Design brief:
Chain B: Belongs to the FPP/GGPP synthase family. Chain B: Isopentenyl diphosphate binds at residues 37, 40, 69, 86. The complex is a heterodimer of chains A (236) and B (308). Chain A is mainly alpha-helical. Helices cover 73% and strands 0% of the residues of chain A. Chain A has ten helices and no strands. In chain A, helix 1 (2-21) crosses helix 4. Chain B is mainly α and 308 residues long. Chain B folds into two domains: 1-40 and 54-119, Farnesyl Diphosphate Synthase (Orthogonal Bundle); 120-308, Farnesyl Diphosphate Synthase, CATH 1.10.600. The longest helix of chain B has 28 residues, at 182-209. The chains are: A mainly alpha (236), B mainly alpha (308). At the A-B interface, helix 4, helix 5 and helix 6 of A face helix 4, helix 6 and helix 7 of B.
């Protein structure tokens, strides 16, 4: 049962990632990081075919997921002028948890002595943050610019990590899939541009992600089956 | 005699902070102008003179540490809800917390970019573990706000993570970037640690003993915010002082706090804290006395003398 095996591999990766993220005092005051298991799935497939030793795979996958966790944790830092005292300390620990997770991935890669992977990820983290600011400052102008920024923020880790190992497919696949997922899960993009309807943007995104899943992955490979069912769930 | 190399570091710094994005570009210039004199590059360059000193390599260690510290200020201001820092407005005030997060993250990732020009994996091992240790200390600081039942080792770990480690690794990383021998860069690690520990103890003493005019802020601000420092640890051995110190919390006013500071200063807590600071300064002079005499040992010896 190849579905069973890949679900067992994801479950192990999920457990090692959670242990690595945990801190007893963070655990008592802020919510555990919300791990995207689609990104987990796609990082596992990407590092399956990368030119690295088998017993390094898990560390590389966790490293990539630690970066994701750092990025996602800081998205939850609020901009509310005054707040409650228990809610301010929560905000303080959220800022610290994200920086802590950054320290952990840099520390993981140093132990493996992979200095170039450090460069790749740091370059990706810089562009993801430039384009978060762009998207947040509503600094774009075109359907092209806006969508070029959404795809960078949502898939540039896969982009840059794939390039690092000269792997095709992953840049377009992750871009189509996670842009669709981010847009499905924004309502004001039409106030600084337009072009087609909200329901036309979404279903065009669904078609691009549907097509890439069916084209860039083997038919009824376990990852294709998972991702295709995930597209349906996200649409629903 | 470092002014030309320190000028090299600043030109690199200034060029590593431009951006085609105007918001990021302008936030970068604002961090360039934060702070007073750059302290960390001096420790890096002086320790680099104990190997094959080469500004075109070791400058990348100084830029990385400067950029890291810049990344910390931006996030410190969100943690502190600071609208002004050292008399100037903050990134988060000019913009907001979310923008401060992203700019800080952009700066921290840029420093890791910078440090990868040092292809020595030992340098990344030391720096990465330092950053983890600093974050852990910031997290333990929140946990221990107003914790008047903590012991000395809690405080010692707090100021190692906040201050000493970073001086320690500014020294070690300077020497390592220049190929210094193991015996030399580990002894420079210990000098920086011992010098930083004694500096931070002095800083904490001064927070009680200086006037508002010297500090540029009210006296006792560490204690008001819940950060227990060394004079409070000795003062807490006085039961009547401890009965007051245990009641300090986030709503305590400046006017309630200042009679307590006067009582602390009438114990022997200040003097007891001085003694610990000078034991650290002495252990820092021991480690220097193991290094080759020369311009670099003299300058580091000067720097420790100014601290005592």
């Amino acid at each position: 049962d190849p579905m069973q095996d890949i679900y067992g591999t994801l479950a192990n990766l999920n457990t090692k990632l959670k242990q690595k993220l945990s801190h007893p005092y963070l655990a008592k005051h802020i919510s555990a990081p919300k791990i995207d298991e689609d990104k987990l799935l796609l990082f596992h497939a990407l590092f399956e075919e990368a030119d690295i030793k088998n017993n390094d795979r898990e560390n590389y996958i966790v490293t990539a997921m630690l970066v994701q966790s750092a990025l996602d944790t800081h998205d939850e830092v609020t901009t509310a002028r005054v707040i409650k005292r228990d809610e301010n300390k929560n905000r303080q620990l959220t800022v610290l948890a994200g920086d802590y997770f950054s320290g952990l991935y840099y520390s993981l890669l140093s132990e493996m002595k992979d200095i170039y992977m450090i460069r790749t990820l740091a370059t990706a983290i810089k562009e993801i943050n430039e384009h978060k600011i762009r998207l947040y400052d509503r600094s774009f102008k075109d359907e092209n610019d806006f969508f070029e920024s959404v795809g960078i923020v949502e898939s540039a880790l896969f982009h840059r990590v794939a390039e690092h190992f000269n792997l095709p497919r992953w840049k377009k696949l992750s871009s189509d899939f996670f842009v669709f997922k981010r847009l499905m899960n924004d309502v004001i993009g039409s106030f600084i541009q337009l072009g087609k309807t909200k329901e036309e943007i979404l279903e065009d995104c669904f078609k691009k992600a549907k097509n890439s899943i069916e084209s860039l992955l083997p038919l009824n490979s376990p990852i294709q089956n998972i991702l295709i069912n995930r597209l349906k769930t996200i649409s629903q | 005699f470092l002014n030309d190399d320190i000028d090299v570091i600043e030109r690199e710094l200034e060029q590593t902070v431009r951006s085609d994005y105007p918001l990021l570009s302008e936030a970068g210039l604002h961090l360039l102008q934060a702070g007073g004199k750059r302290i960390r590059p001096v420790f890096v360059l002086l320790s680099g003179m104990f190997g094959d000193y080469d500004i075109n390599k070791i400058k990348y260690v100084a830029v990385t540490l400067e950029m890291i510290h810049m990344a910390s200020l931006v996030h410190d201001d969100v943690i502190d809800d600071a609208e002004l820092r050292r008399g100037k407005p903050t990134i988060k005030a000019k913009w907001d917390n979310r923008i401060a997060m992203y700019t800080g993250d952009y700066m921290l990732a840029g420093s890791l970019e910078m440090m990868t020009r040092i292809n020595e994996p030992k340098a990344h091992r030391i720096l990465s573990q330092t950053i983890v240790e600093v974050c852990l200390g910031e997290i333990e600081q929140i946990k221990d706000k107003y914790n008047m039942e903590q012991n000395l080792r809690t405080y010692l770990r707090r100021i190692k993570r906040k201050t000493a480690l970073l001086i320690a690794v500014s020294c070690q990383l300077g020497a390592i970037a220049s190929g210094a021998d193991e015996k030399i860069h580990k002894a420079l690690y210990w000098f920086g640690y011992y010098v930083g520990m004694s500096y931070q103890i002095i800083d904490d003493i001064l927070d009680f003993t200086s006037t508002e005019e010297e500090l540029g802020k009210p006296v006792g601000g560490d204690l008001l915010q819940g950060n227990v420092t060394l004079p409070v640890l000795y003062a807490l051995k006085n039961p009547a002082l401890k009965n007051q110190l245990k009641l300090i919390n986030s709503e305590t006013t400046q006017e309630q706090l200042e009679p307590i500071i006067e009582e602390i200063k009438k114990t022997d807590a200040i003097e007891a804290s001085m003694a610990v600071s000078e034991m650290y300064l002495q252990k820092a002079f021991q480690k220097l006395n193991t290094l080759p005499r020369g311009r670099a040992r003299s300058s580091l010896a000067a720097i420790a003398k100014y601290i005592g």
